[PDB]
A paper describes a structure:
Mupirocin, a clinically used natural antibiotic, inhibits [name] ([name]), an enzyme that links isoleucine to its tRNAIle for protein synthesis. Two IleRSs, mupirocin-sensitive IleRS1 and resistant IleRS2, coexist in bacteria. Specifically, type 1 proteins (IleRS1) are strongly inhibited by mupirocin (Ki in low nanomolar range), while IleRS2, which are homologous to IleRSs from the eukaryote cytosol, exhibit resistance to mupirocin concentrations that are about three orders of magnitude higher. AARSs catalyze the formation of AA-[name] in two steps within the same active site. The amino acid is first activated by ATP to form an aminoacyl-adenylate (AA-AMP) intermediate, followed by the transfer of the aminoacyl moiety to the [name].
To understand how IleRS2, but not IleRS1, accommodates the non-canonical motif, we used X-ray crystallography to determine the structures of a pair of [name] enzymes from the same organism. Apart from wild-type PmIleRS1 and PmIleRS2, both of which harbor the canonical HXGH motif, we also structurally characterized their corresponding GXHH mutants, all in complex with a non-hydrolyzable analog of the isoleucyl-adenylate reaction intermediate, Ile-AMS. The insights into why IleRS2, but not IleRS1, can tolerate the non-canonical signature motif came from the crystal structures of the pair of PmIleRS1 and PmIleRS2, both in complex with Ile-AMS. However, superimposing the HUP catalytic cores of IleRS1 (residues 50–174 and 523–635) and IleRS2 (residues 40–168 and 513–632) unraveled conformational rearrangements within the signature motifs in the active sites. Relative to IleRS1, the KMSKS loop assumed a more closed conformation in IleRS2, as indicated by a 5.0 Å displacement of the first Lys backbone towards helix α1. No such ligand-dependent rearrangements in the HXGH motif are observed in PmIleRS1.
Author numbering: 1 to 921
Write the structure that this text describes.
């Protein structure tokens, strides 16, 4: 009214309190209406392509915080490359087959796969799949992820299944596919084989056994009174024993007497004495391990022949130098068993129950038969000691129940035949973090052959036929026919036709003169479905190319997608399907614990999406070291939300006091700018260069703090703080405020473009309040390009010292605020006693120091009288009262108030501004 003369923040069109949860959905509505993904893709249609191939998440259910972190990090890279001279097509995907879907339906929906036909259960899996891919798609959109959502890929599509058969066929033609009876992981709960990617390790309690094997034929080395000692944590494997293993040359065993003579490795005498609790024991003689070859022993229960074998797998670290060898339940046992032609015995069926191969324990679950086995061992007297240990044990990745080794006929990919090319691909790939290279390298050099056959329904069947010779039929014509047949009708055609209707129209094989063929029923590993994505997506789709330039998935994918995709591509191409890998850790609670509902620490993405919003989560992703494990909690997100509050206030302030400025022609030249403004221009360009470099190096934590530092202290507390009382009081065409707001315009234009990859809900919201809008959204322009500023280094040194000195002056003002006598900064007059260095810097100031320090008046003298006021290390300061008339407009205490007859209550500055008009008003 009479006290105020406007000159406030006009543009409140950007609200202060951020109600993103109710505003962001409307923001996404306009993005979908304009089809912004197609716009940026069309704009960069001729630019070089940077492909970030999306790892297909499972459709097991709704998204968790880990899903969001994956997509948000992908969105950061794609958005930056879209507006940095690259074409960045991003198509989502979904891994649809496998146990993650069957187990979800079986447990949650209480359906029984054995109460319905295979076709019916597969149809139910297909229904639940599309339900989840639709639900996950909308949840990703709410987060604010840009991509080809209307045209994604799923693993159940016939085109994908057709190409996956081609991938399998190409490897088979190379000779990398074979079938054999080998021990592999078995899940009795799922009644199927498994691989390491389908295995989770948990601590499990197992019974430790020290058992004795009697000697029948010592071959002139041992008498019948000696007995071998065996340590085993798997009692159920005893009925399958066919031999005993000992190290031939490196380890020499001895005979120990504790009332009876036992055979044990020499280096384990003390360790075996404390376990069996021997009282008095004496060594008889020493025998080299190789001398014990072909010694015949007896089974403690069945008294069958057990052949002592030589192998390098037996170690001193075990409980005894002799190891029970069961070729049907162990990798190393199978290898040595085949070396000596030992029988392969697997008395355990697919459901984990003992079969007729174990006479005294038939029908028992393997874990439930451990106690009866020990009881029979103790009845025979061969049991020495029984104990219990807890150790990490493999478990099914879906049923969470333990797995066992079973020797069964399975399909394998011969990794050993091209392991060298796999190692070369890892060495030629760029890994971020760096340890990822050694992570996958060692996983390959120590990997065995990959079991790819699964005894389940929901998946892609293995395209192998069998003739009357029972010879597997794999050839390019059969592979081509089934691939085209799958492309038309899908994988369902395999489960609804006999073999002769799935073959070429006139195919005949030598092994079956009658033309009577049969088909395979096992399906492929779900990791093979995802590992064929590069051939079916990067190669088949025209919008993408192979190899992709980056893979971005979690740390668990080194066993999974990173490994399987490399295996299929190097088998076919010989080269890696990716030029680089970016790895992110897992999401944890505030105390570094797994987010499980059991702990009650789950941070639901939808929970944060509605309580806080999307850009808050986007900042949180950029606020953490994703490359390692990340910890999240509601309190942490509130801190991130508070940071967004400071960012939002700075943007509102920048938009507000910039309203009365049109930079179309009111642009102040760089030479005409204030040296104070020129320093901010240098700082802005340094910020642009650092942010763009950080995007290239993928260091988002640097961007998060750099922007936070640039706004909280550098701009809002130092530069905008001065402009809070200078911009609007002066004339609206004054070169001072016009030049300052050219800097504000440059910051607003550049910062809005910089933040666009990380935050877009607020970036486009600010982009609306831009005087010069040549593109509909901020995502349609490129990132700002750094521009050199003349005399930058000299001004950086000068004004960084000036910033330091101002902070000390503010500290002196805050000391006066502690006194609260003046209780004001602008009204206070200053008498300064600077150091020669400080005095030289003040002399170099060509601007008004009074307005910079937001003080009424400043005088400089070498009084050198400290009194009791203050003295900074570079200047002595006195905060004095001016005692003049206070202006009613600028609030500056100035003696000039009253000199103007028309405005006796205004100073000369305010009186001149009020009286004079530039051209109008
Ligand atoms: C199937 C029953 C559960 C696993 C039960 N918690 C249980 O067995 N708990 S335990 O503490 O006995 N676990 C010991 C492990 O060793 C086996 N075991 C237990 N008692 C004996 C025994 N007397 N002789 C041989 N093996 C035995 C169990 O199968 C379990 O894996
Ligand atoms: C590339 C994806 C694989 C082929 C597989 N479908 C898969 O892992 N599917 S998933 O849906 O379970 N996971 C997809 C991505 O999410 C990561 N992830 C899973 N759980 C978490 C977690 N708790 N914290 C952080 N990231 C996590 C996976 O590593 C993968 O990148
Ligand atoms: Cl089941
Ligand atoms: Cl063992
Ligand atoms: Cl048929
Ligand atoms: Cl058939
Ligand atoms: Li707070
Ligand atoms: Na049913
Ligand atoms: Na079969
Ligand atoms: Na089957
Ligand atoms: Zn005034």
């Amino acid at each position: 009214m009479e006290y105020k003369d406007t000159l406030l923040m006009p543009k409140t069109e950007f609200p202060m309190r951020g109600n993103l949860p109710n505003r962001e959905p409307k923001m996404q509505e306009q993005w979908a209406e304009m089809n912004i993904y197609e716009k940026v893709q069309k704009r960069t249609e001729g630019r070089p392509l940077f492909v970030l191939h999306d790892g297909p998440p499972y459709a097991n259910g709704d998204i968790h915080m880990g899903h969001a972190l994956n997509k948000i990090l992908k969105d950061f890279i794609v958005r930056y490359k879209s507006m940095s001279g690259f074409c960045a097509p991003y198509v989502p995907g979904w891994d649809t087959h496998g146990l993650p879907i069957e187990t979800a339906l079986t447990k949650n929906k209480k359906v029984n796969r054995k109460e319905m036909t295979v076709a019916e259960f597969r149809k139910l899996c297909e229904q639940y799949a599309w339900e989840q891919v639709n639900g996950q798609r909308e949840q990703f959109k709410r987060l604010g992820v840009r991509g080809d959502w209307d045209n994604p890929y799923v693993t159940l599509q016939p085109q994908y299944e057709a190409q996956q058969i081609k991938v399998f066929g190409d490897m088979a033609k190379k000779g990398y596919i074979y079938k054999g009876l080998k021990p592999v992981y078995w899940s009795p709960s799922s009644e199927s084989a498994l691989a390491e990617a389908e295995i989770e390790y948990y601590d499990k309690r197992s019974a430790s056994i020290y058992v004795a094997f009697n000697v029948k034929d010592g071959k002139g080395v041992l008498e019948q009174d000696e007995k071998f000692i065996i340590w085993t944590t798997t009692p159920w494997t005893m009925p399958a024993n066919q031999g005993i293993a000992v190290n031939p040359e490196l380890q020499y065993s001895v005979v120990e007497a504790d009332g009876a003579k036992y055979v044990v490795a020499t280096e384990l005498i003390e360790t075996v004495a404390k376990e069996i609790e021997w009282a008095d024991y004496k060594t008889l003689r020493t025998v080299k391990g190789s001398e014990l070859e072909r010694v015949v022993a007896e089974h403690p229960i069945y008294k069958r022949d057990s052949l002592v074998v030589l192998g390098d797998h037996v170690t001193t670290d075990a409980g005894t130098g002799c190891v029970h060898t069961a070729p049907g339940h162990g990798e190393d046992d199978f290898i040595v068993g085949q070396k000596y032609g030992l029988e392969v015995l697997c008395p355990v069926d697919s459901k984990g129950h003992m079969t007729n191969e174990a006479p005294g324990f038939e029908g028992l679950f393997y874990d439930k038969a451990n106690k009866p086995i020990t009881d029979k061992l103790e009845e025979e007297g061969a049991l020495l000691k029984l104990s219990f240990i807890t150790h990490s044990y493999p478990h099914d990745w879906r049923t969470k129940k333990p797995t066992i080794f079973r020797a069964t006929a399975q399909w394998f990919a011969s990794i050993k035949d091209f392991r060298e090319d796999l190692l070369k691909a890892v060495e030629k790939t760029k890994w971020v973090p760096t340890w990822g290279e050694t992570r996958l390298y060692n996983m390959v050099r120590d990997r065995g052959d990959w079991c790819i056959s699964r005894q389940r329904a929901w998946g892609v069947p293995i395209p192998v036929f069998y003739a009357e010779n029972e010879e597997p039929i794999i050839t390019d014509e059969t592979i081509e026919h089934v691939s085209n047949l799958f492309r038309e009708h899908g994988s369902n055609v395999w489960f609804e036709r006999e073999a002769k209707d799935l073959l070429p129209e006139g195919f005949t094989h030598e092994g079956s003169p009658n033309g009577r063929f049969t088909k395979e029923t096992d399906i492929m590993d779900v990791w093979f479905d995802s590992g064929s994505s590069h051939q079916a997506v990067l190669e088949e789709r025209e919008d993408l190319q192979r190899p992709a330039d980056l893979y971005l998935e979690g740390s668990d994918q080194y066993r999974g997608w990173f490994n399987s995709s490399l295996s299929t591509s190097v088998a076919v191409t010989g080269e890696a399907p990716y030029k680089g890998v970016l790895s992110h850790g897992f999401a944890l609670d505030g105390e570094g614990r797994k987010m499980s509902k059991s702990l009650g620490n789950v941070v639901i993405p939808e929970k944060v999406m509605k309580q806080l919003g999307a850009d808050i989560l986007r900042l949180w992703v950029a606020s953490v070291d994703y490359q390692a494990d990340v910890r999240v909690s509601d309190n942490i997100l509130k801190q991130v939300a508070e940071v967004y509050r400071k960012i939002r206030n700075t943007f509102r302030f920048l938009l507000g006091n910039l309203a009365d400025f049109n930079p179309t022609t009111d642009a102040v030249a760089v030479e005409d700018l204030r040296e104070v403004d020129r320093y901010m221009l240098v700082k802005l360009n340094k910020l642009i260069d650092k942010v763009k470099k950080s995007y290239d190096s993928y260091e988002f934590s640097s961007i998060y703090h750099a922007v936070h530092n640039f706004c909280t202290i550098d701009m809002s507390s130092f530069y905008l703080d001065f402009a809070k009382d200078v911009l609007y009081i002066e004339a609206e065409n004054n070169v001072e405020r016009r030049s300052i707001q050219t800097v504000l315009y440059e910051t607003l234009l550049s910062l809005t473009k910089l933040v666009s990859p990380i935050l877009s809900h607020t970036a486009d919201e600010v982009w609306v309040h831009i005087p010069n809008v040549t593109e509909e959204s901020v995502q349609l322009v490129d990132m700002p390009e750094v521009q050199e500023i003349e005399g930058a280094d000299q001004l950086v040194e000068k004004w960084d010292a000036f910033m330091e000195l101002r902070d000390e002056v503010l500290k002196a003002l805050e000391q006066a605020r502690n006194e609260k006598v003046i209780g004001k900064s602008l009204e206070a007059k200053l008498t300064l006693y600077p150091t020669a260095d400080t005095k030289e810097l003040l002399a170099s100031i060509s601007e008004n120091v009074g307005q910079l320090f937001i003080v009424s008046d400043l005088e400089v003298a070498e009084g050198e009288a400290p009194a009791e006021a203050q003295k900074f290390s570079y200047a002595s300061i006195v905060v004095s009262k001016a005692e003049g008339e206070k202006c009613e407009r600028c609030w500056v205490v100035s003696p000039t108030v009253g000199e103007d007859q028309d405005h006796p209550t205004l100073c000369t500055r305010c009186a001149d501004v009020v009286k004079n008009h530039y051209v109008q008003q």
